[PDB]
Design a protein around this ligand. Sequence first.
Ligand SMILES: OC[C@H]1O[C@@H](O)[C@H](O)[C@@H](O)[C@@H]1O
Length: 477
Amino acid sequence: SMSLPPDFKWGFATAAYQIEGSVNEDGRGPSIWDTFCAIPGKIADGSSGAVACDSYKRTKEDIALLKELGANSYRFSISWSRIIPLGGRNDPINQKGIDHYVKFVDDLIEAGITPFITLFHWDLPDALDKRYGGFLNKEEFAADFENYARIMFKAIPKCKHWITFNEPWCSAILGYNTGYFAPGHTSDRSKSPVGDSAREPWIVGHNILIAHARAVKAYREDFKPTQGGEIGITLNGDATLPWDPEDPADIEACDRKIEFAISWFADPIYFGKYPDSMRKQLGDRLPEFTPEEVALVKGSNDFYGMNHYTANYIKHKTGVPPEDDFLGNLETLFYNKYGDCIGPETQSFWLRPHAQGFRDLLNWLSKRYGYPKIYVTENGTSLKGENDMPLEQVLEDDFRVKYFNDYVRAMAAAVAEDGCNVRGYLAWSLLDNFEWAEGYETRFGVTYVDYANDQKRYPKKSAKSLKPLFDSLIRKE
Ligand SMILES: OC[C@H]1O[C@@H](O)[C@H](O)[C@@H](O)[C@@H]1O
């Protein structure tokens, strides 16, 4: 029923912009998020990644925290603009930036912690966006990304777990359909002077796939022979249930939703084509790969990186969807035809807990993609009103304890009962941190960070719950 293999990797996850602070220190150049946060109205509490958890200066304390919690693994990202402040292949490299991360990894390894390193977690160097529209220029972006990646592969050979992109769905849809995330492109001219919500998202997804696959080929050809290790992309995606369990169109739409959200990226990576359902709806707004691109992209995951948070009921729509539609001509809802609920609210409008969906989606993905090795690179939750609670109540985060309990056991059943090859689980997040367009109000941390008192760390009940939870699941031999 529930049991995990002895080598199982587990720990916590973070991202550079969300935690590091020191946004102008040691040569770092601006990212598209530094710029986006300077624009009134884009961040709900008017804040930015300035200061954040001050983790750039507190690596030693953060490592000691990981060790105190029992983690054997830690996922973090590299700020590209600390490595190449302007980002490009002909721009000057910042050795201080490199040395910071090389040392960090030496120190993690010395503490007995396996590093999982994300190259790109949304913080595109601003200059690349300004020069050529960043992801919108296929050849320029792929060349600059591959160059950046090779610098990191060469400098950090002790890392054996590399992630290219985090959640390209976010970068494409939220960055170029709705403008909710940097760089804020949308057709809506009351929010952005540039963008085309019907066309730019699909170009952005396409070109990220190309860049990913170049970085993977570089890793496999020039580094893996002598350094070993593995590389893949991390995709997010939520589970689906039919709004009307008797309606075959809703049942079909549960698959279609997942195809538009995840298979957009995974079908190219495993099969060398986009989902037929996407081709049908988007037609020539969805780019086509050339034969050379198909060969490059197909087979470009050593493992499947999975981020997962929630589930939705799916209600099919009829007729022709608007050109700005990205869901696949359907509606997502938290209540079904019979008034059944996904789960209670959290601080995030889009997140309700549903552990069964995690198990369901693990199965769906494993079946569609031939049982790849899966690392769960993010899973966790916010808690409604957490930012307003007194300390004693914040630390007693029973709701979050429960989220991890149910989601981790659901995953363990996916493994031991359903045969899914999950080999790691990284809790989002080690620390309360900057939650993008929501600012600091939305807390995902297993560790409370007191921003008013020098970002002092207090482990919550959840933080201490994970080690005994995994002790109950991971086989000794
Ligand atoms: O309507 C788009 C919404 O979709 C959700 O799944 C995203 O995570 C939100 O961050 C976003 O604003």
